[PDB]
Design a binder for this molecule. Structure first.
Ligand SMILES: [K+]
Ligand SMILES: [K+]
Ligand SMILES: [K+]
Ligand SMILES: [K+]
Ligand SMILES: [K+]
Ligand SMILES: [K+]
Ligand SMILES: [K+]
Ligand SMILES: [K+]
Ligand SMILES: [K+]
Ligand SMILES: [K+]
Ligand SMILES: [K+]
Ligand SMILES: [K+]
Ligand SMILES: [K+]
Ligand SMILES: [K+]
Ligand SMILES: [K+]
Ligand SMILES: [K+]
Ligand SMILES: [K+]
Ligand SMILES: [K+]
Ligand SMILES: [K+]
Ligand SMILES: [K+]
Ligand SMILES: [Mg+2]
Ligand SMILES: [Mg+2]
Ligand SMILES: [Mg+2]
Ligand SMILES: [Mg+2]
Ligand SMILES: [Mg+2]
Ligand SMILES: [Mg+2]
Ligand SMILES: [Mg+2]
Ligand SMILES: [Mg+2]
Ligand SMILES: [Mg+2]
Ligand SMILES: [Mg+2]
Ligand SMILES: [Mg+2]
Ligand SMILES: [Mg+2]
Ligand SMILES: [Mg+2]
Ligand SMILES: [Mg+2]
Ligand SMILES: [Mg+2]
Ligand SMILES: [Mg+2]
Ligand SMILES: [Mg+2]
Ligand SMILES: [Mg+2]
Ligand SMILES: [Mg+2]
Ligand SMILES: [Mg+2]
Ligand SMILES: [Mg+2]
Ligand SMILES: [Mg+2]
Ligand SMILES: [Mg+2]
Ligand SMILES: [Mg+2]
Ligand SMILES: [Mg+2]
Ligand SMILES: [Mg+2]
Ligand SMILES: [Mg+2]
Ligand SMILES: [Mg+2]
Ligand SMILES: [Mg+2]
Ligand SMILES: [Mg+2]
Ligand SMILES: [Mg+2]
Ligand SMILES: [Mg+2]
Ligand SMILES: [Mg+2]
Ligand SMILES: [Mg+2]
Ligand SMILES: [Mg+2]
Ligand SMILES: [Mg+2]
Ligand SMILES: [Mg+2]
Ligand SMILES: [Mg+2]
Ligand SMILES: [Mg+2]
Ligand SMILES: [Mg+2]
Ligand SMILES: [Mg+2]
Ligand SMILES: [Mg+2]
Ligand SMILES: [Mg+2]
Ligand SMILES: [Mg+2]
Ligand SMILES: [Mg+2]
Ligand SMILES: [Mg+2]
Ligand SMILES: [Mg+2]
Ligand SMILES: [Mg+2]
Ligand SMILES: [Mg+2]
Ligand SMILES: [Mg+2]
Ligand SMILES: [Mg+2]
Ligand SMILES: [Mg+2]
Ligand SMILES: [Mg+2]
Ligand SMILES: [Mg+2]
Ligand SMILES: [Mg+2]
Lengths: 263, 158, 134
RNA sequence: CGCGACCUCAGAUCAGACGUGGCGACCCGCUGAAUUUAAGCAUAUUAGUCAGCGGAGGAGAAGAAACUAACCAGGAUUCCCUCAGUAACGGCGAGUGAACAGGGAAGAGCCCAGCGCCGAAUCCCCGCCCCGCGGCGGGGCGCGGGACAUGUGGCGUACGGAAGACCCGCUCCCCGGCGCCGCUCGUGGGGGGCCCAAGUCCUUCUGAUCGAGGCCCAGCCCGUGGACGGUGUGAGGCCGGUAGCGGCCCCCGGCGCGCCGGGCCCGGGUCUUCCCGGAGUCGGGUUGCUUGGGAAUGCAGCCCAAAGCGGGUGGUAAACUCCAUCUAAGGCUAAAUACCGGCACGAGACCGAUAGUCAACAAGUACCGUAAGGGAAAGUUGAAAAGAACUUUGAAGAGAGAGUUCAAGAGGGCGUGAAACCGUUAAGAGGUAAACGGGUGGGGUCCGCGCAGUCCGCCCGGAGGAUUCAACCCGGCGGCGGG
RNA sequence: CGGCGACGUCGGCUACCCACCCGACCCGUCUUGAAACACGGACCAAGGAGUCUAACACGUGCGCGAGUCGGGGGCUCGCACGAAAGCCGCCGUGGCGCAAUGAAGGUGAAGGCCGGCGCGCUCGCCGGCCGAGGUGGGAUCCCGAGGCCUCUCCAGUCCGCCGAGGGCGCACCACCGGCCCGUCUCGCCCGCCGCGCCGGGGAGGUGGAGCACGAGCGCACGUGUUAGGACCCGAAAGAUGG
RNA sequence: CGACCUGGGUAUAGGGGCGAAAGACUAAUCGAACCAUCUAGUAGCUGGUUCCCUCCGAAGUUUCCCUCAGGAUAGCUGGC
RNA sequence: CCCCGCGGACGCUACGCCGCGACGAGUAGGAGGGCCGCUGCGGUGAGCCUUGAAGCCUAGGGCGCGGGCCCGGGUGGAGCCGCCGCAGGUGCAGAUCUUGGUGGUAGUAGCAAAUAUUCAAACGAGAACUUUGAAGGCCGAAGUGGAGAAGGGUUCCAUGU
RNA sequence: CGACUCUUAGCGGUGGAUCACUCGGCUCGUGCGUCGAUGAAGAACGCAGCUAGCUGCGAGAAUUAAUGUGAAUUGCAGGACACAUUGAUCAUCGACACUUCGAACGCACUUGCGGCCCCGGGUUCCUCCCGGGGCUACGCCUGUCUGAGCGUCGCU
């Protein structure tokens, strides 16, 4: 808010012997404003309580190792059908979810051939879900240039830009991402992992050099290595049913003993 | 009032600080603007190095940093004398010169003159009139080998 | 989408430019599509509405195939008056009903030297675009 | 005993110029509080801040060491990070509080006076002619005036400089045009003008539709254009626009070439001989203020008042001694930096008419005060005025009909239309003011497809249909196991 | 097991009005004590008060971990989003941590056992090993005599459970030793390019925010304290300029 | 008929004026006018401080304080 | 060595489900949970909506200990909500609170300073108040008369409403 | 029986909450970064066929010219306007013009009064009256002209 708002009045309190509240009062006469309360957060036309100020610390710094580890989690979740389906991406007829296409796509120039590719990869149903989701926002966002909302579509990840960005980008929901410049804001749009991502082959191959293996450090980050699992085998049912576990267990106590009515 | 254990704090907020607060919302815009100026300057001096003149090898002053070597303001007049470069010609060919630096030891003097002689060898000089080359350079190498060098010229290296 | 950083997508600004527009660009705003025959005869799609061209209303109460000559282009109200697009008022006289020029198609153009210049202007630019994207 | 020269002054509506005042967010020079904190209060703090005065510009100021250091040294200014809430100051209380080094942004250096040399080499003004106009310049001419030896110009300034010899290299500058480039540049350099894709297709919803279904060939059409706004809804294809190293037209600027007008005039190394500096200033005492600067950081007043192997600094006063470092008392200088005023733009996890600027509107307006100054309230018919013709009562306001509209149970302060409060109608009740908690009862409005009150698994019996039930054959697909 | 069910009745403790019995003083606030002859409150609508920044402390979550952190800068078509995100590594300068102690000059954290020798003189030269000592507790873990089994026994074939005792002992606690810096008391040796008003070492007390095989750094959240208008409203005043 | 009453023009302005003196008057304001700003001045003092349920649950005592309507401190409380 | 039957309920959002026992006051204050509520942002609901959104009204049906919520009917006429996260200028009965509106008081207090009006007529829908005439009074020349200064600024004068 | 009072509901008033909307703000960022004696900012008074405010404008007054544009403006009226022997409107804006105060400039203002030089008219040159035009501020720089001094001198 304006630093001057509510404080350009020259109002003063009337005192205590005049049967009115001790709030400051606008001086003068001949106008409605005269004798009206001022400066208070409870006063109409006064200053708001604790006026909002520009130095609110809007930004946050996140450790680089944090941020790289969010990208790795987002990428790993994008290869599991249950998580991508749980984001609602209509990957029903997609041939394979770590979904990789030939480098020829990077050289696309027309939107028609971008549309044709999505139909032939069975990714067009995701676009039609974006079309069905185009409606108006609810509330004051309409007055604030956020008039339209829609669903997020698939993410196209490319190594080179030979026109692929221009070929797409008119398709609602489609976001294009350079593999060398991955954005967690685009890979996990709402903070939820599992966005549908179509990969170009060159971008797919650069992925090992970009984040490394567990036996190679990344050759394009100079100090990064893949985060380590604190649980190698996350198959609880298989672990619990293993003969090693079952041999060490005591017999289950499955009879229920309910209170006995004291006769 | 003090409350239990704590650090005796002395904040310096008694002096109407809110009227002199420097926000940094123009920091991204400032980085963009300087980068445009850097790119425009590099284009203006098309074959000349983008960073600017060659700077001398300099040892840092105090007992904390005197094991470390950095770049200085300009080559000394003594350094230019034994390198055979006029102090008024050097600034025209990208050699920074500091008239107020003296050389207390020969090693520092002798290290900087090899820097000058070696830079002189690496230098490609275009004739003032391209049609008539007096003593600039051979056109065979000044045509194809002429490239704007990026980064500091011969970076100072510990 | 819009990439030019000097043209605004702000809703308040666009509305403010539209309702406070000077009459010489209110003319461009008040453009109408041409009929299929005219869009085929001239390689142009739309045309600013003119005083003495004759159109048919394609939306609203007065839709139909009847051809009415424009009789007034009242730019302050962003409407045009057509011959038989009118209604009776209480005291028995007729008043023209203003309709938006975007809801008519021009079946016939009032042709002078200036319209013909604009007509070939638009067609030539379209032809350049066709041979650019061939 | 007048006439001249000079000096110091004066007048002029003399010829030609310049300053004044405004804005003032940012900047420079002064002046400068108190509230406040210290739980009192005077030093301190607030604060070199508010208020006051002066002066600028697109930036200003600063700035090329009388520096930092003490190292193996760095090297103008300005800004950022850090140093660092540190050294230090402080009723050593409350509180205050830098700098160097380091890493970056930017980076640019120079000019006089003096000392000397050169026949004042110098400058202004006025007439005449030519080339031009585009902010008024260039060239030539004048026994044309003036300034100036009480000192103009060239060379030259501490990084040393000059002059002579000896040797070497002839090496090549800046200005305004003629015609044309590369087309000026992340693909125009800028300003202005005008243009450039695709559904108003079929059936339907509606007052209106931009809504809902559909559009064979992998699917209506365009998409480098699915930003936005308008249009009777809610529109990529109706319109303006949007995308595009898209088109056309008009205007302006510095960039290279050949030529033109004129200037344009020796540079380096060695040796020798010479020449080298800013004074009521520095510094000292004292006083007041200021600073983190503490036996005194800086500034200023008064008194004293310099030197030249000198002077300043070397964060504890002083003497002696060595050492280091710079060279004051003259001047200029871009960039990085600042910007709550101005011109023109873009955007937003902001506000949404008691909010957000005081001001969404004929708002610094109406109005108030002698004045300084104070300072509001106030948005919305409808898609379209289609803004109620006409009849009738009344003097009229106002009514009853009629009419427009999808709607006037939208009728010019008219979208929606809450509560308080009021009128009327309906029901109920009423001498302990109303109101309330618990428990029932009566009445009433409504609800229950209430009104002969579940469903469904197996079996038994009766009366009918349909294939085909099982098992085999062929084919397809899955699950599990396999040295 | 019985009765009753459509234009009259059936069920609906909720909800509307009324009646009766019992109970029942008007809230908010200060206060030992409010129904108070204590203050504020006629009614309704809308507005209306612990916020943000900075700095600490502790707790919790996340990443990395004796390291950690790019926040300033730079590089990436210069920009729909994107003022975002990504990257730098001779951009880690620097911050915090990794060492303390003293006013300072300064100094600055390894012991235990086995042997021959001076004299194993409370001790000096070495060897060899192991690498922060020991006591008492100490989750957990290890060994474990002896038991628990089958239609039965002479005789062991494989492992499972209970198990008196015993062992290694995490973290942590109490205590005793040891080591570093300051300062006292005592005392004897050693070193040399500077033989000195030089330098070093020992034993015994005592001062330290220390060592004794690191736990920190960054980010986020919460709470608490503080400086700021500082939860909101409120003086009598003071100052400057008109 | 007088130190008389009165118009207009002038002069004196805030710690100042003016006062046959009452701290009177100085634009309904005077034991220090009015206006704007410093300023959202400070307040150990008064008033207020906005949804629900669940669990736990006090103190008016100690010591020190220009302390006695306030703090610090221990105690009592809650949470982890 | 299941087989005349080839068959055999539910469960276990593990942040879930189930069992047993004890317990339940509370100001100041602390903590937890909230599928309590408001506004906006990132995701998601192939969500809702002119075949009617928000809002508002309701002797309508219910749910929850509660904060509150869902549904029916009416009005209205263009937008809105659920879930996972994120962020606040996020919840009112008070503050002699701010602004706006409305009551009782109440058809009440009151419309009482300076002697005074009456008759007829005209215009007019309408006459205690206007105009004319008649009568009775008052100011009584230090005026309730006739003209100016200051101040006001069109109030002056006709016609009309 | 009615009145009155109370509760509830329907309808109607009063009132303007709520909700939806937004040519307005607030905040951040970007590029420019330009006033004035050649009269600024500000003020006053005027200017439209019908016009009070706002807005625009300056006696050429809700605008002239020029250029772009291309048929309107509009509340009503009027008259234009072949759109080519050139054009409505709007935009731009480089030509022209721009009343009185105001640094405000002849002197002075809650008023008014001069002086000098030209031109025209009454005069029928000589200077009186009327009108028109141009000048008449302070400070200051260079130069010019006119001067002053028992300032310093020179010659007579
Ligand atoms: K300190
Ligand atoms: K001369
Ligand atoms: K277009
Ligand atoms: K002094
Ligand atoms: K010296
Ligand atoms: K207001
Ligand atoms: K205003
Ligand atoms: K309506
Ligand atoms: K009371
Ligand atoms: K950074
Ligand atoms: K480090
Ligand atoms: K130390
Ligand atoms: K606070
Ligand atoms: K004043
Ligand atoms: K008098
Ligand atoms: K006073
Ligand atoms: K007491
Ligand atoms: K949503
Ligand atoms: K509930
Ligand atoms: K509704
Ligand atoms: Mg406000
Ligand atoms: Mg809403
Ligand atoms: Mg105090
Ligand atoms: Mg106090
Ligand atoms: Mg005091
Ligand atoms: Mg100031
Ligand atoms: Mg000035
Ligand atoms: Mg400057
Ligand atoms: Mg300077
Ligand atoms: Mg110098
Ligand atoms: Mg530090
Ligand atoms: Mg200070
Ligand atoms: Mg740099
Ligand atoms: Mg000279
Ligand atoms: Mg189009
Ligand atoms: Mg629309
Ligand atoms: Mg649209
Ligand atoms: Mg374009
Ligand atoms: Mg000393
Ligand atoms: Mg307002
Ligand atoms: Mg409203
Ligand atoms: Mg009336
Ligand atoms: Mg309606
Ligand atoms: Mg209404
Ligand atoms: Mg009623
Ligand atoms: Mg109280
Ligand atoms: Mg009491
Ligand atoms: Mg009470
Ligand atoms: Mg009592
Ligand atoms: Mg009280
Ligand atoms: Mg009240
Ligand atoms: Mg009261
Ligand atoms: Mg409220
Ligand atoms: Mg970044
Ligand atoms: Mg370091
Ligand atoms: Mg132990
Ligand atoms: Mg011990
Ligand atoms: Mg604490
Ligand atoms: Mg005082
Ligand atoms: Mg306050
Ligand atoms: Mg106050
Ligand atoms: Mg004391
Ligand atoms: Mg009290
Ligand atoms: Mg309880
Ligand atoms: Mg609030
Ligand atoms: Mg309230
Ligand atoms: Mg009465
Ligand atoms: Mg009476
Ligand atoms: Mg009488
Ligand atoms: Mg009279
Ligand atoms: Mg009259
Ligand atoms: Mg009503
Ligand atoms: Mg014109
Ligand atoms: Mg006079
Ligand atoms: Mg004389």
């Amino acid at each position: 808010v304006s630093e001057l708002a509510g404080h350009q009045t020259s109002a003063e309190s009337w005192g205590t012997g005049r049967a009115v509240a001790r709030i400051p009062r606008v001086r003068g006469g001949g106008t409605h404003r005269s004798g009206q309360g001022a400066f208070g957060n409870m006063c109409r036309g006064g200053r708001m309580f604790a006026p909002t100020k520009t130095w609110r610390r809007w930004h946050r710094r996140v450790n680089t190792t944090q941020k790289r580890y969010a990208i790795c989690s987002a990428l790993a979740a994008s290869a599991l059908p249950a998580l991508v389906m749980s984001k609602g991406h209509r990957i029903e007829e997609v041939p394979e979810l770590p979904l990789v296409v030939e480098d020829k796509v990077e050289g696309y120039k027309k939107t028609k051939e971008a549309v044709l590719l999505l139909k032939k990869l069975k990714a067009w149903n995701d676009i039609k879900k974006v079309y069905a989701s185009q409606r108006m926002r609810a509330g004051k966002g309409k007055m604030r240039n956020r008039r339209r909302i829609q669903r997020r579509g698939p993410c196209i990840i490319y190594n080179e830009d030979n026109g692929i960005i221009k070929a797409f980008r008119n398709i609602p929901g489609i976001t294009l991402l350079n593999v060398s410049k991955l954005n967690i804001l685009k890979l996990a749009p709402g903070g939820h992992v599992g966005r549908f991502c179509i990969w170009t082959e060159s971008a797919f191959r650069k992925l090992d050099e970009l984040y490394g293996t567990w036996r190679k450090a990344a050759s394009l980050k100079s100090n990064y290595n893949l985060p380590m699992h604190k649980m190698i085998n996350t198959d609880l049912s298989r672990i619990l049913k293993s003969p090693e576990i079952q041999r060490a267990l005591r017999a289950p106590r499955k009879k229920i003993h309910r209170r006995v009515l004291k006769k | 009032a003090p409350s239990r254990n704590g650090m005796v704090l002395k904040p310096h907020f008694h002096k109407d600080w809110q009227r002199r607060v420097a926000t940094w919302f123009n920091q991204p815009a400032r980085k963009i603007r300087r980068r445009k100026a850097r790119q425009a300057k590099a284009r203006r001096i098309a074959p000349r190095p983008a960073s600017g003149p060659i700077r001398p090898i300099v040892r840092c002053p105090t007992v904390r940093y005197h094991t470390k070597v950095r770049a200085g303001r300009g080559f000394s007049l003594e350094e230019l004398r034994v390198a055979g470069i006029h102090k008024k010609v050097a600034r025209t060919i990208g050699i920074s010169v500091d008239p107020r630096r003296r050389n207390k030891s020969t090693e520092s003097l002798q290290a900087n003159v090899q820097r000058l002689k070696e830079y002189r060898s690496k230098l490609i000089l275009f004739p003032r009139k391209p049609s008539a080359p007096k003593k600039g350079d051979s056109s065979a190498e000044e045509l194809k080998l002429a490239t704007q060098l990026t980064g500091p010229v011969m970076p100072v290296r510990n | 989408m819009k990439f030019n950083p000097f043209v605004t997508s702000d809703r308040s600004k666009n509305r403010k430019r539209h309702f406070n527009a000077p009459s010489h660009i209110r003319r461009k705003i008040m453009s109408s599509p041409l009929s299929k025959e005219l869009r085929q005869k001239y390689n142009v799609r739309s045309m600013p509405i003119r005083k003495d061209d004759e159109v048919q209303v394609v939306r609203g109460h007065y839709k139909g195939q009847q051809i009415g000559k424009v009789v007034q282009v009242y730019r302050k109200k962003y409407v045009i008056y057509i011959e038989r697009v009118q209604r009776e008022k209480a005291n028995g006289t007729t008043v023209h009903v203003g309709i938006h020029p975007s809801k008519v198609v021009i079946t016939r153009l009032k042709l002078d030297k200036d319209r013909k210049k604009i007509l070939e202007r638009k067609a030539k630019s379209r032809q350049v675009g066709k041979e650019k994207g061939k």
